[PDB]
Every structure is written in C-alpha cells, then in structure tokens.
Write a protein that holds these residues in place. Structure first.
Motif, short mmCIF file in Angstrom:
data_model
loop_
_atom_site.label_atom_id
_atom_site.label_comp_id
_atom_site.label_asym_id
_atom_site.label_seq_id
_atom_site.Cartn_x
_atom_site.Cartn_y
_atom_site.Cartn_z
N UNK A 37 -27.59 -0.26 37.31
CA UNK A 37 -26.52 -0.50 38.27
C UNK A 37 -26.93 -1.62 39.22
N UNK A 38 -26.03 -2.59 39.41
CA UNK A 38 -26.31 -3.73 40.24
C UNK A 38 -26.92 -4.92 39.53
N UNK A 39 -27.32 -4.78 38.27
CA UNK A 39 -27.76 -5.94 37.53
C UNK A 39 -26.56 -6.67 36.93
N UNK A 509 -4.93 -15.74 27.82
CA UNK A 509 -5.67 -16.04 29.04
C UNK A 509 -6.38 -14.79 29.56
N UNK A 630 -1.27 -24.90 23.71
CA UNK A 630 -1.92 -24.11 24.73
C UNK A 630 -3.42 -24.32 24.67
N UNK A 631 -3.99 -24.61 25.83
CA UNK A 631 -5.39 -24.93 25.98
C UNK A 631 -6.13 -23.72 26.53
N UNK A 632 -7.37 -23.61 26.17
CA UNK A 632 -8.19 -22.61 26.83
C UNK A 632 -9.55 -23.23 27.10
N UNK A 633 -10.46 -22.51 27.76
CA UNK A 633 -11.83 -23.01 27.88
C UNK A 633 -12.50 -23.24 26.54
N UNK C 11 -24.79 0.93 43.78
CA UNK C 11 -24.96 -0.03 42.71
C UNK C 11 -23.90 -1.10 42.63
N UNK C 16 -26.74 -3.77 47.14
CA UNK C 16 -27.34 -3.04 46.03
C UNK C 16 -27.71 -4.00 44.91
N UNK C 17 -26.79 -4.91 44.57
CA UNK C 17 -27.10 -5.90 43.55
C UNK C 17 -28.32 -6.72 43.97
N UNK C 20 -31.35 -4.69 43.41
CA UNK C 20 -31.56 -4.55 41.98
C UNK C 20 -32.12 -5.83 41.36
N UNK C 21 -31.70 -6.98 41.87
CA UNK C 21 -31.96 -8.25 41.21
C UNK C 21 -33.09 -9.03 41.86
N UNK C 23 -36.00 -10.96 42.58
CA UNK C 23 -37.22 -11.35 41.87
C UNK C 23 -38.46 -11.03 42.68
N UNK C 25 -41.53 -12.57 43.27
CA UNK C 25 -42.12 -13.47 44.26
C UNK C 25 -41.34 -13.40 45.56
N UNK C 76 0.36 -18.69 33.40
CA UNK C 76 -0.80 -18.03 32.83
C UNK C 76 -0.89 -18.20 31.32
N UNK C 78 -1.33 -21.03 30.19
CA UNK C 78 -2.16 -22.22 30.07
C UNK C 78 -3.64 -21.94 30.17
N UNK C 79 -4.07 -20.71 29.96
CA UNK C 79 -5.49 -20.50 29.75
C UNK C 79 -6.16 -19.80 30.92
N UNK C 80 -7.34 -19.26 30.63
CA UNK C 80 -8.09 -18.47 31.60
C UNK C 80 -8.23 -19.17 32.96
N UNK C 81 -8.45 -20.49 32.97
CA UNK C 81 -8.71 -21.15 34.25
C UNK C 81 -7.48 -21.16 35.14
N UNK C 83 -5.29 -18.69 34.94
CA UNK C 83 -5.37 -17.29 35.31
C UNK C 83 -6.23 -17.10 36.56
N UNK C 87 -4.93 -15.61 40.11
CA UNK C 87 -5.54 -14.46 40.75
C UNK C 87 -5.86 -14.79 42.20
#
Ligand SMILES: CN1C[C@H](O)C[C@@H]1C(=O)O
Ligand SMILES: CN1C[C@H](O)C[C@@H]1C(=O)O
Lengths: 791, 791, 113
Positions: A37-39, A509, A630-633, C11, C16-17, C20-21, C23, C25, C76, C78-81, C83, C87
């Motif tokens: 959790x958290x990673x 999308x 339609x374009x995507x990444x 978590x 919390x992250x 958890x993360x 490093x 050093x 939307x 037109x792709x994830x970007x 989207x 959002x």
C-alpha cells in the motif's frame, strides 16, 4: 506412433476436466497489493504477481513432460481483481450455471472471494472505474445493444505476441540483469520522469524474480515427486522436468525441450498477470527451429520426441480458459483465450519459412485435437510448398477446424498499414482471432469493442430508435420515407456510422486512460525490448510500435444486404414503397410475408452478385475512414472485422432488416454470407468477400466457410481445397477457416452432448468445443451454409 | 477510324522531327535571373519561368488539336542553365554528334548560349556546385565506375506525379488565388520563417501567372491563325483551340478537351521548370473520366473524338526529349523523359477502376506507336477485368512494347512501405521507369545514382582495386584466396555493399543540400496541396509525404550469378580453386577456356534454380537494410532496381566475373537473367525474380522479357500472355515488360536505320526508338533471351 | 476521525505513499537530521499567490463558464489526452460550484440571523 500413447492419456485427462473458477490467484494479487500500500501501482502489481507466482498452487499431472498452469487446476479461469473483480461479485452465485462459459465456483472460493478479495477492489478495479466513468452516449449506445464496449475493461491486454525471441535469447535472468543495469544507471535525483523509469524497471525486476521462482517451485516439486516415484521411466522424466524447469525460463533454453518449457512458463506467467485472449505463441516454427535442428543433429532428441513435446505443449496451452463476465461471454464464447500459434510464411530473407516445425505445428493440432492453441498458417502462395498447404488441407479435412489459413501478404500489408517497416513486417503473426501482431514489438488493443453494422441499418430504418424499447438510442438521421434517392438513404447510413464510430472512439479514450493507469503488465514488458530501452511499460507505449486500438465491426452481410436490398427493392425495382417496407420491418414481417420473400430474394452478398456487392467497398472504406480520424497516444485507431461470437448477442438488439433478416436473430458471422443466402459455391463467396478492403482493416478480417465433407474426399477433394485456398490468396482475402462436419454430428451434439465432449467447431477466428457453446451460438453455427460446390 | 487520318498526319509530323538543342529557354531563364539579382533563388527561378513562358516561341502545328511544347520545336531538349549549364559548355561542339542522344546544337544557338548564358552560370548551377563540392570518396568511386552519381545533379526533380486532381479541379487561377490568400494571411513581421513562407507563396504566384500567360499566348496565336485559315474545318479547330487555351490550365476544365489541354499545358510548364524524366501523368483514366462521361452525355463529344484527342495528347507528350550530359546519356538513352501514364488498378472504394479511358489509354498507345508516353497498366488481378488484360496483351503483341504490367498490390505495398496510409496507397502511380508515386502528394528523388552490383563483386574478387586502372577505388575486403568458406566470401560482399551504399549515401547528402537551396520548383509546387498548406516548396519538404531518395541498384543477375557461381565452383563442387579462378578472371578468361566454360555452366539466376537463387533474398535484403539505415531531411533512403540502360555503361568498368561474364561487357539489365542463361522458359524466369523482395524496393524493380513472336499468335498466345501476367501477380512480382519483335528486324534496324526510324524497343522501364540508341545498348537489347517457352 | 476517516486513507494519502516510497539514502539523511524532507508531503502546495485579478475580474461564475465552454469544445472521442483535460475542466466546474455554494450558505446564514 509410440508417443501418441502419452498424448492420448494427457488428452483424456484434459477432457475429463470440469471448468472451475480460480480465486487463489486473485487472493494473492490482493495480498500483494495490500503488502505494498502506497507504492506505485506498477510496483504493487509486480509484487502481487510475484506473490501469485511464489504462492499459487502448482501441479504436475500424470504423463506431463511440459508443466505449468495459470490457476490451481487445468481449464480454471483466473480472476484478476485489479481488472474484473466486480464481475465475480455480481455473478458470485450464477457463474456456475450461466448461459455462456460457466465456471464452477466452489463455496470455498466464494468465501475467499467475498471475504479476502472483493472488499479491497470495490471502486478500484479497472471494470469499476469504467462503470463509474462511462459517459452517457456510451451507456446509451451500449444499453441499446448498438455497441459492446466492456470486453477489454474486463480482461487485460492480451492481443499481442510476446518477445519469444528475447525470452529465448536471454532468459528471464538476462532480461532482469538488463533491467538491473538500466536501474543502476538511473538516478532518482534526476527528476520525476526518471523516477517513473526507476519504478518501471524495479517493477520489471520483481516480475522477473517472480517468474524464475515459479519455474523453480515446479523443479522443486518434480524433485520431490521423483523421490516418491516407483516407476523408473516416470522418475527419469520427472528428474528431467526438474532440470528443465531449473534452467528455464531463467536462462536461455539449452535444447528443444527447454525452449518449449520456457515459452510455456512465460506464457502462463503473462497470462496470470492479466487474463486475456491472444497471448500469441506466434511463429514457434521460426523461434524453435534452432533448437530442434541442433538436437536432431546431436542425437539428444528425435523428431518424434519433438512431436511428443509439441503435443504436450498444445495440451498445456489448452488448459487456460478465458474468464469473463456473463455478457461478454456471449460475445466471446467457448473460453477462447485464443492463443494463436502459426506456421509458414517467409523468413528474414523473404524466403519460404516452412520447416520441420512448420509441419509439426500442424501435426500437433491433428494429434491433440483440442480447441487450442488457435493453430493457423501464414500461407505464402509465392513461396510456401504445396506439401505444407496440403498438410493444412488434410488437417482441415479431419474436422480439426484448423488451421485458419492466412494470405501471408495480406498479413504483411496490414502490418505496413500499421506503420511497421517491411524490414520487420515479413515477421508478422496472426493474433487471437484474426488480428495482426509482431513478436515483442507491436502494442495495441486489437479489439476494444464492437459496432453493430446491423444496428447501423436499424438506426437508419427506425430513425435512431431502438426497435426493442423505442427509446432514442442513436441520432435522428430522418424518417426513411423522406429519402428521395438511394443517396439520401446512404447519407443516413453514413451519419449513423459516424455516430457509432464516434462513440467507440469515446470509449477508447477511457480504455486507454484506465489501461495506462491501472493495467501495467511488467511480466509482459520483460519481453518487449523497446520497453527496456525507453523504460516504459507495454501499457505506456514502451513497445517499439504502438498503434491505436482496434474497433471491431459485426454484421457485414447484414449491412451489405440491407443496403443492396433497399436500393434494389425500394429505389431501382420499386417493388415496394419505403413506407410499406418500414411497416413490414416494424411487423418483423408478420403479416407481410410477400415482402419478406421479396427481401429474401433481393440480391444477397456472397454470390458474386454485383447488385449485392456494388456497395461493399464504399461502406467499409467509409467506415474505416471514420475510425482512422481518431487519434490516441498510441496512434490513430484501427479496425477489424472479427465478430467472434458477438454476432449472436449483438443481433438480439437489431430488429428486422431489409435484407430479410427477422428481428433479434443473429447477424452474419465474419465477413461472409448470411446463412443459406449463398448458393453460388465457395469461389463465388470468396469473390464477394474480396470486395471488402481487407488491408484497411489492420486488426484483421475473419471469414468462415463450412464445407460439405464429401467435397474433401480423395486427392481430388484435397486439390480442390488447395485450389480454393490459393484462390483466396489470389483474391487478396486475408483469412479463411473451415468447418468440415457431417451436419448430423452437430445436431446430435445438441441432444446428446455427453457423447460429443471433444466435438470441435470453428466459431469466429477461434475453435471451441461445440457442446460448450450457448445454444444460440450453436444454432448460429448449425445454420451456416453447408457449401456444396467449390466454384 | 476517320480520326486516324489526323493521327497519322500528326504522327508523320512527329516521326520526321530532327532532335535539336533549345537555348532560348536557357537564355530567357538567364534573363529572368539577371532581372532578379539580389532576390531569393525561389523568386528568381519563378521570374525566370514567367520569362520563359511569356517569351519562348510557341507553335500550333497542322492537325494539332492540343498545343504547346517545352522548346522552340517538338523533341528539342531544353537547358535549365541553373542545373546543367556547364554541360552545354563542355559538349558545345560534341553534342550534335555524341554517341548517346545527340542534340543538334545550331551554330547560332551555340553563339547565343556562349555569350548570353554560359558566363552567368559558371560556378552557379547545381552541376557546378556538385563538382566543386563532390567529396573525394564519391569521386574515386565514380571514377572507376563503381557508382554513377551525376544524373540528378544534371536533371531537376522529375520522378513524380503532380497533383493532377488539384490542377483539374482548381485551375491555376484557383491555386494562385489560394497562394494569394495564404500570402495575405501571413505577416512578414513574424520572422525569418514566415518570410520564407512569403517568399515561397510569391514564387507560386509568379509561376502561376506565367503559366496562364503561356496558355493565353496559345489562344492568341490560335485566333490569329484562325484569321488566316481558309478551310472552315481547320479554322473552326483553331477557334476551339483558342477557346480552350483561354480557359485551361487557368480554370477547371469545362470538358474533356479542356482537361487534356490543362494537364498538357501544365505538364509542359513543369518540364520547362526543370528538364527531368518522369513528370508522370499518372492515372488519366481516373482523373478525366468524369469529363469524358459528362461530355459524352452532353453530345459535346464522342468516344471517337475522345480517343482522337488522347492520341493527339500522346504525341504532344512525346514531343519532349530528356536532356543530359554525354555520359548520363549512356545511362538513360533514347531521349527518355519517361512520362508514365497508367490505366487500371482500383478506385477509392477498392473496386475495379477500369473504365472507358482505361481502354482508350491502351488504344492511344496502339494508335500512336511512339516512344512516349510510358503507358503502363496497374493490374489488380482480384478486380480488373480480363477484357482489360487482354487489351494490354493485344497491345504488347503488336510490338508497341507497352504497356508494362504492374502487379497492383505490389505497387500498393511499396507506397505503404514509404509510409503512405492504405487510405491513399490504392492511388499509387508507377513513376518514370518503375518507381512509385502518389499524385500531388509524394516527394523524393526516386533514382539519384547507380550502384554497380557487378562492381561490388569485382571489388571482392580484386580486393577493392580497379581491373581497368589498378587503382585502389573501393575498400579492402581481403584476398579472395583467404576466404576459407563461402561465409567469409559473403561477408566481404557485404562489406563492399556497405561501402558502396555508404558512398551513395554521402552523395545523397550533397544532392539534397543543393536541391533544397538551388532547385525550387514553384510550377510543380502549384499542384502539391500540402506545399500550399505549409508554405514550403516541393524541394523543401512541402509535399504531404516525403521519403528519402532512391539508390538505384544495377547488376542483379551479375552479382547473384557471381555469388552463386563462386559458391558452386569454389566451395560446394570445389572444381576450381579460388586462385585458379582469380588467375582466370585477371586474364578475362584469356587462355582459361575450361574455367570460362565451367563458369558459364555454373547455375544461373533466372532458371528457378535453387543452386543460383539461394542467395537472392539475403543479398538484396542486406542491401536495402544498408540503404535504409541512412536518414535525410526527407526520411530514410529508399531503393529501387531500375538500371535504365546503365547496365551497359556501368558494365564497361567491371572485369570478367565468376558468373562467366567477360570483362567490360554490359551487366544484366533490370532484375532478370543474363542474356542466354535463362533457358527454362518465362515462368521459371519469373519464379527466379520472385526471390527478390520487391516490397523492400519502394522505388520499384524493372523486369524485361523478350518473347518469341510465334509464342503470341492467335487467341491461345494471348491466353498464355495473360496466364503469364497472372503468374506474375501470383508471384508478387512488381513489374514486367515485353519486347515482342522479330529478331531480324532488330538486326536490319542496325543495318538500315532509316528503314526503321519508329521501331520501338522496350529498354528498361521505358521505350526508346531503337535507332536512336547507341549501338552497344542496341547490342544489349539484341542479346536478350528470346523466350521461346511460356512455362 | 478513527472511525470515519483514518481507515479509508491508510496507504492512500500522500504522506503514506512518501513513507512507503522513501529511498534509503533519503531515509538515512533524514534519520540523521541532516535534511528535513517531510513537510510538503504533509501539507499541500500553498506557497503561491493565486490569480486574484482573475477572481476579481471574472468571479467564480465567469471562470466556471469558461470551463463549461472549454469542456463543451472538447471531445472525448479524440483520445485519452483530451479525456484528461475534460477531467480537469469537470473538476474546475465541480469545485467552482462548491465555492459558490459555500458563499451562499454564509449568505443564507446571514439572512437567517
Ligand atoms: C477472443 N478474442 C480474439 C481477439 O483478440 C478478440 C476476441 C475478444 O477479445 O473477445
Ligand atoms: C529514365 N529515368 C526514370 C527514372 O526515374 C530516372 C531515369 C533517368 O532519366 O535518370
């Protein structure tokens, strides 16, 4: 043949296997995620799969030479709760007896699921995200059955050929060493982008540690089993299993035995990482020729022992089974994880690639006679020997339903059209159903979802309204009686396509969004070398080649015949008014049976009839034109015509059609003729399908043919099968596949399934056990034209 | 057919035309440049072409329905002083009697050139720059004849198919109106990059004004001629000629007559812009079909009149004659402007594109029986009707030497491998000889220079030293007596190929640099829509699709046979020692009659012999792999196998070869077999050449066959021709050409040139008048195998 | 807190992250008191001057209307970007409706008083 004794035994053990739902996998993924959790989700997910590999139950069944599993039992479906956890929670109590692809889910595993798995994953799995985010046009279109949009949200990527050559060349250890090298070179002080790479490489290394462990666990098991084993022949082969599994897939294979087990262990591992179809073995006859040839030359192995090993490989492959929700199962029926291995084609010099392995790949299918792997042949008419096409025709004639035969060059063209250079496109691999892949190098969802071309005609005819419910499901392209000319009708068709395609792109999308964020596949990324170079998962475009995900298109015969028959009946013959047609169409033809016979008699696609086929090129180039804007990444969206079994469910949403199709029946399978409307021979049917622009559909094209077995008897029958197959290449047809089955055997299988448990049928780009299909899918298959003339 | 009276007369006019060297074009271009000192090259070039267009003398010949020209008389070669001034100066007194393509330079044109033209261009024209700059690695390979590098520095771009559809639908005014509008929407206060755009749009506008000036001069001249014409029939044609040249290319053609004049006027202006081969008309049959069909509906034209115009058009096109230096001429003999125009193929819906004009395209060639246009057939076996194929074969049988038949799908694959989407690749047009193009959308030199594969093999056998001079001209790959196995031999062949290709890549860097600075083509850019959208000339990446330039590869059968025969003689059969072999090669087989008989008898490329054809895919995939590693501002380099007639000159630098080829004779033409070695029939010949990876050569492959006339008699012989062409497609062979000619005629044509001034021969991707070809090229054609067996 | 807040965020929250993360050093130097590294993981961005001029010239309704319009122009399909932008704009719109609500609850409270 001696080794056939063992193969028969393994087969019998496969047949007696009940299909059960695995949950231990899901349980261990959950432990993994909780343990981290958290990673970053990529760490979490890699640790989960290491938890799965280190902890899952493992087994070594009697007579096995190659060993492994994705679950706790052969044929068991695994649940990847990071994707489809709510599925098992919604059909916890029905999945054991659901219409399509039931999985026996023990009461034990229900409790494990509900208690230890389901709670963690609510609102967190990919499927739950999608249900949360689904925009309303998608939900409207989906709920009206014009689209199926849920498949790839339920089941991982699949739809790709891993880097079998990297796994063979380096082993999982060499790959993890490279990741360790990349990782040591990176500095987390150099900013967030580098940390992302650090995370991905760390996630590669955990995955790599997990996979080698699972292979060592099996070796440990075989060790212990061998101490316990009275039979000195089995004990010997058990200690061999110990030595083989100790070496691979950690290290590069030492021999053909080990190369096979290497792929098998890795195949199982990437499958466990994400249940999904189309984890293609690809060109085993090319990958493994070096080890087969060395052993034969060395005496360390015989050709028949290699066949034995390949036959076991086939059987192990067949012990996976696509899991999915009950709806998606009607669209993807027969537990078709659909692992395509292929034979033939050309080598890196464009020379004929057919070798001993090529023939034996076919021979593994004839021997083992299961539904998987989905064994097919890249057939180069210009280069591959007649003997190789012949052995494929004999395999088909035996009712093995495979191979599916690909016009090699059509397959190459599709990869070029995907942006892959010719220097690499010779090496394409057919994928899953009929899609196109490239070992360790091409990344795509080949099938995000289905548009119903039948729906498109229904929306035109009913001005965007569901005939079932009456709601406005699509856009209003007008009252079809206002169509003065066939051009206005065609404009309507085209506007509707824009909407169906636009909606599929909308869905794409969200899918690319949820995938990139919540579907890292590090075990798979291990075998995509470009992923190592750039430090990005397969999910995040690390592969050498990315294309846009594939939109799938169901109902060729239904769209083509309705357009042709409306032009013919309304606009050229003027046999009936548009008004009368619509009323006939609203009545589902009840009370208008002279109109129905008029529809049935109007031109039908599949006969080389120009009055039917004149429109195929226009509609489907138009369709692909929309998709590609339609374009995507990952690039511009792609297209395919691999309906799977989805023509059956998706037709339940489509009312009566001007082609004569009665409401709620199945749409046409594949790209071919509606059942019983092709009566001009095989050759004429191929000519009709050649009107499709196959190369436009880079996610492939899937054609069925059901041949009357009497046409394949004797050498004359064989020659005629080969003539037809060569005819397909000449007509540039990407793909064909053949059911060859006495039609009384299929009807007996409906009434006495117990006596036909291994009855294989070719559904749509993949084979299934016939008794394991929902009856409607069975009936769809039964009613397909038995083709009595070659032409 | 009555109209054949006018075509006969037009054709007699053409056949009696002496080939002269025009200077007025160069003079007026020098004036335009002088009048523009201090201006960007692009403005100068443009103004120099306004001046050429508005001042050059024009003519309207008896019986001509379509008018124009690129020089003071038909068939005159023009001097673009900006590209090749210094060639006219070095050959001022030899060009009228030089061995290859003589051009009679009038003493008066000599004087005008030397006094008003040569001075201005010294050190200024691209040829001058290239010689200033040519790096020494190029020089010493060019010297010694391993590469031919000088073509494209002498002769402008060409090798492309202009935007015929843009011209036809918009007219030059329509385009100028766009350039003017883009110009008005740019503000030169926004920086050097915009000023460059502005400079480019202006150059388009200036070009466009000049081309409408030129057309109007023709209308003017026609009305004045009309005033002096007694016969009302001729007077009425001259009045029609006036009406159409007032409209086109300025405006979109109102009819089929106007559309033809439009392309022709434009085609002549872009040839004037730069002397160059392969400004291709492309798919006339598709561009003009709606004019032809509307005109036929309107009673304004009959199919007969449409045929007659096209015949006129064919002759007009023939009235250009490519110009170049004396040495380039040996590589491209016959005044071969190679203006390709193909019928057939598939339309935008993937459907049979064959229509009336597709047949009239072949018909025109049969009517005019001239060397241009280079009329060719895009033949889709799955779509084009046999009737079309038979017409082609009937035209070939008549001795027209055309059309060349292209396997349509192969043409598409090459455009796909150039990165053209299948959504546009259906629209490919063969280019110049056999390269690939896309109407108004694709930019590249398709042929910058020639690699001698002969030379490659000579360089291994002689450790990189010239057999002629003894100089070290290539790299060192080792004494061939030290190659323990064929693999070291092949490794050396690869090393030589690496160095040849490398040195061709070096010359390409210079060609692009000079091209991009000193070879704007504003006229050509008028019909590239994307140059207008980005505001960069064709020469600066304006086109929608740029690929790197095409390295031409000569000596296929020669390296194949030499490789194969070294392997058979020295390594498999060990019936000749490498030293014995080299001693005999150093001797040109002089006194080694037994060794030469053994090499002649070793396997020969072209017989479908695996002992010979085993290496084809490997050497030629290696080669294209080498070419493809090199990038330019326009993409990776490309490759083609279109030796033109360079196998004759390039052969004068290659000593005897282990294939048995004596020293300094021609290499094998195109990609087929060495004359007199293919003894197994046409079909085995096609099978041998199918081992070439035609796909990888995106600039095409050129295959010659010569068929015993007796093989084509009657309906059966046509049938066999068609079967052959279908076998071609089956085997995925890009291209074939057919000489069909009694051999005596050829030999009489050497004794009695004047009895044969119109005897056409298919040379290598194009047609020449046999009597205009240098004897040694005639001898090469004569010693081509007369295939006496279809197979 | 313990019953309705703490369990959901374990978590999950940024701190919390971070733990958890972290490093090693970084851990060593923080455990040694050589760096202090935690406080921006604990508490958000702050450390900025927001667009007061924008708030004042447009008010939250003006901004929310620009977002409704940018959102309406976007597709939307037109792709994830796209989207991701949709959002973000959705989130501006939601958060802006909330600010206005809180201003109005105060107005409501003042009117009740
Ligand atoms: C069985 N699968 C093969 C193809 O990858 C598509 C299909 C699916 O995902 O439903
Ligand atoms: C005959 N031409 C066709 C090729 O495009 C180039 C060649 C030339 O003239 O150099």
């Amino acid at each position: 043949k001696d080794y056939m004794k063992r193969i028969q035994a393994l087969r019998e053990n496969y047949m007696s296997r009940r299909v059960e739902m695995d949950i231990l996998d899901a349980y261990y993924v959950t432990q993994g995620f909780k343990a981290t959790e958290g990673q970053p989700w990529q760490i979490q997910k890699a640790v989960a799969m290491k938890t799965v590999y280190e902890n899952k139950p493992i087994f070594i069944q009697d007579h096995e030479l190659l060993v492994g599993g994705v679950a706790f039992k052969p044929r068991a479906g695994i649940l990847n709760p990071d994707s489809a956890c709510s599925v098992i929670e919604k059909e916890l109590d029905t999945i054991s007896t659901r219409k399509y692809d039931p999985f026996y889910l023990s009461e034990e595993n229900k409790k494990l699921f509900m208690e230890e798995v389901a709670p963690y994953w609510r609102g967190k799995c990919v499927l739950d995200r999608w249900n949360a985010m689904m925009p309303e046009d998608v939900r409207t279109m989906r709920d009206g059955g014009m689209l199926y949009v849920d498949k790839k949200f339920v089941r991982g990527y699949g739809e790709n050929t891993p880097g079998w050559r990297t796994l063979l060349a380096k082993g999982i250890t060499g790959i993890k060493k490279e990741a360790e090298e990349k990782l040591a070179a990176l500095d987390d002080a150099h900013g967030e982008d580098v940390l992302k790479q650090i995370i991905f490489y760390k996630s590669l290394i955990i995955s790599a540690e997990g996979i080698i462990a699972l292979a060592n666990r099996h070796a440990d098991l075989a060790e212990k089993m061998a101490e316990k084993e009275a039979d000195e022949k089995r004990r010997a082969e058990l200690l061999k299993i110990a030595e083989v599994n100790r070496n691979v897939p950690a290290n590069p294979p030492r021999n053909f035995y080990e190369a096979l087990q290497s792929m098998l262990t890795y195949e199982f591992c990437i499958f466990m990482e994400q249940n999904a179809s189309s984890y293609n073995l690809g060109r085993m006859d090319q990958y493994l020729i070096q080890y087969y040839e060395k052993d034969l030359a060395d005496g360390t192995m015989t050709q028949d022992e290699a066949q034995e090993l390949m036959d076991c490989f086939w059987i192990k492959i067949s012990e996976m089974g696509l899991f999915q929700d009950g709806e998606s199962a009607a669209f993807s029926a027969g537990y078709n994880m659909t692992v395509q291995v292929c034979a033939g084609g050309i080598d890196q010099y464009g020379n004929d690639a057919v070798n001993d392995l090529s023939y034996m790949t076919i021979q593994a299918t004839q021997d083992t006679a299961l539904k998987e792997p989905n064994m097919t042949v890249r057939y180069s008419i210009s280069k591959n020997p007649d003997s190789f096409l012949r052995k494929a025709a004999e395999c088909i004639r035996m009712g093995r339903t495979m191979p599916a035969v690909y016009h090699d060059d059509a397959g190459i063209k599709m990869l070029l059209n995907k942006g892959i250079p010719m220097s690499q496109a010779w090496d394409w691999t057919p994928c899953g159903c009929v899609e196109t892949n490239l070992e360790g190098r091409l990344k795509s969802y080949t099938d995000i979802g289905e548009i119903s071309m039948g729906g498109v005609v229904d929306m035109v005819m009913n001005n965007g309204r569901s005939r079932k419910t009456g709601e406005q499901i699509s856009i209003r392209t007008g009252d079809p009686r206002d169509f003065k000319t066939f051009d206005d009708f065609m404009a309507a068709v085209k506007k509707q396509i824009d909407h169906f395609v636009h909606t599929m792109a909308t869905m794409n999308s969200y899918l690319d969004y949820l995938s990139e964020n919540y579907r890292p596949v590090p075990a798979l990324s291990l075998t995509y070398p470009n992923c190592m170079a750039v430090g990005k998962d397969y999910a995040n475009g690390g592969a050498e080649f990315n294309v846009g995900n594939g939109i799938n298109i169901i109902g060729q015969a239904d769209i083509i015949n309705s357009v042709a028959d409306i032009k013919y009946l309304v606009f050229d013959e003027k046999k009936i008014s548009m008004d009368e047609l619509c009323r006939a169409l609203d009545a589902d033809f009840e009370g208008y049976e002279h109109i129905h016979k008029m529809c049935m008699d109007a031109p039908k696609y599949g006969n080389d009839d120009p009055k039917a086929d004149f429109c195929v090129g226009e509609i489907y180039n138009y369709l692909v034109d929309q998709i590609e804007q339609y374009d995507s990444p990952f690039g511009k969206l792609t297209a395919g015509m691999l309906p799977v079994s989805g023509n059956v469910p998706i037709g339940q949403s489509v009312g009566a059609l001007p082609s004569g199709r009665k409401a709620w029946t199945p749409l046409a399978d594949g790209i071919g003729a509606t059942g019983g409307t092709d009566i001009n021979g095989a050759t004429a049917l191929l000519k009709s399908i050649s009107n499709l622009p196959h190369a436009r559909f880079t996610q492939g094209t899937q054609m069925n043919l059901k041949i009357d077995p009497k046409l394949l008897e004797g050498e004359r029958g064989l020659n005629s099968m080969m003539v037809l197959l060569k005819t397909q290449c000449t007509l540039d047809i990407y793909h064909t596949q053949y059911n060859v089955i006495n039609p009384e055997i299929l009807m007996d299988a409906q009434k006495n399934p117990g006596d036909h448990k291994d009855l294989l049928v070719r559904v749509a780009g993949y084979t299934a056990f016939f008794v394991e299909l929902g009856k409607d899918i069975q009936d769809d298959i039964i009613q397909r034209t038995e083709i009595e003339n070659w032409g």
